[PDB]
């Protein structure tokens, strides 16, 4: 298997799991990821305040490029 993970792939994967929204929700993370991996991003993703923000919106893009 290919173990290469890039920021563009991580952001696009989060965006896919967020059904193409520019932010992701906690309940979407809990539905789609292992409970352990769901709590990790919930704790480390900053609040999303960009266009179309709603209560609970998490900035997976800021989270992703912080690492990759």
């Amino acid at each position: 298997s290919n173990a290469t993970d890039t920021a563009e792939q991580v952001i696009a994967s989060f965006r896919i799991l967020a059904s193409d929204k520019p932010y992701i929700l906690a309940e979407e993370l809990r539905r789609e990821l292992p409970p352990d991996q769901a709590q990790y991003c919930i704790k480390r993703m900053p609040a999303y305040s960009g266009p179309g923000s709603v209560p609970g919106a998490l900035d997976y893009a800021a989270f992703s490029s912080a690492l990759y």
């Binding site: 298997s1 290919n2 991580v10 696009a12 799991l17 991996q37 990790y40």
Partner: protein, 303 residues
């Protein structure tokens, strides 16, 4: 003091990476011909890891088939081993399905036929791959209709005829066979179970066995507890479901073989048996499947 790869090949960009390898494009300089160099740094490998590396190199040299990666050259230098393969440029099969947008049973049948031809070839050569999964299914090029290429013989083993043995707990959790999970002797049928898992995903875009609790996942696999739920399975032909059932048979002695699967009507009579209907929900699910896979590894890599 012999450095044939360093002398004769030029390395370029990374094409992919494994846990303990990097794959870089290379060019045989005198010829101008491009290849993929799978490079293993050997300086800190354990004795057992050396043996596994040597095993992969032997198995790769043995396997010559249109649906299997093709070894061009193999070079040992002081602290590095190079497996030089013909370059495949089409990327992962599952990424291509999503990118090309449209997918039917007929497409899935053509795809699994090639995977089965590769598996049959391995088995005819006394090789069991043990790690059939989407990430090891590449495409030969970006040309439409490019051949599927089975890759990554890093877990493959050599068997003797039809003898079963405890070859160890190896593989990827969602694709593991009941007999491996039971710690029973196993052999060629493990690859056909994995093919059934892959075929299931090709039809609906999500895996037949899935649980965040790995203990529970393994219970479900050992119990053969998968389903064909409505609505998505309502439009899948009975023949496709029948082939999946025969691959996902818990008893490995009753499980369909690669040779038998290639004669199954949904494969051998695909043009009259497999549906031609596009399955939008399958492609949409596959997009999420690929996303979950990528994030699973990337979230662990960040941890």
């Amino acid at each position: 003091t012999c450095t044939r790869f360093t002398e004769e090949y030029q390395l370029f960009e990374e094409l992919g990476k494994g846990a303990f390898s990097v794959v870089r494009r290379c060019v045989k300089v005198l010829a101008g011909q491009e290849y993929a160099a799978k490079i293993i740094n050997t300086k800190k490998l354990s004795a057992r890891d050396h043996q596994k590396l040597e095993r992969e190199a032997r198995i790769c040299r043995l396997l010559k088939h249109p649906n299997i990666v093709r070894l061009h050259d193999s070079i040992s230098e002081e602290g590095h081993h190079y497996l030089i393969f013909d370059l495949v440029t089409g990327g992962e099969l599952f990424e291509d399905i999503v990118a090309r947008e449209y997918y039917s049973e007929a497409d899935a049948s053509h795809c699994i036929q090639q995977i089965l031809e590769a598996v049959l070839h391995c088995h005819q050569m006394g090789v069991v791959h043990r790690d059939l999964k989407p990430e090891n299914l590449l495409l030969a090029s970006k040309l439409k209709g490019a051949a599927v290429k089975l890759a990554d013989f890093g877990l493959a083993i050599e068997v003797e005829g039809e003898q079963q043995a405890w070859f160890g707990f190896a593989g990827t959790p969602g694709y593991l066979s009941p007999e491996v999970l039971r710690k029973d002797p196993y052999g060629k049928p493990v690859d056909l179970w994995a093919c059934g898992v892959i075929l299931y995903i090709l039809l609906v875009g999500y895996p037949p066995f899935w649980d965040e609790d790995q203990h529970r996942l393994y219970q479900q696999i050992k119990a053969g507890a998968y389903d064909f739920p409505s609505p998505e399975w309502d439009t899948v032909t009975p023949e496709a479901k029948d082939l999946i059932n025969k691959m996902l048979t818990i008893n490995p002695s009753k499980r369909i073989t690669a040779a038998e699967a290639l004669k199954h009507p949904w494969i051998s009579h695909r043009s009259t048996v497999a549906s031609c209907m596009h399955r939008q929900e399958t492609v949409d699910c596959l997009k999420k499947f690929n996303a979950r896979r990528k994030l699973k590894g990337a979230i662990l890599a960040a941890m």
